[PDB]
Amino acid sequence: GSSGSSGLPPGWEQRVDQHGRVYYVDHVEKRTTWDRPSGPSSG
Fold this sequence. Notes:
Blueprint (H helix, E strand, L loop, with lengths): L11 E5 L5 E5 L5 E2 L10
Antiparallel strand pairs: 1-2, 2-3
């Protein structure tokens, strides 16, 4: 909500697709997600 912190935790990467949807890549978990690893998930 406010400007203070911005980035990702230790072990997660930051990449983007050809569509323009930012997604992180875990090098320890080997998973791809457009949103942070924490939060609600849509089935």
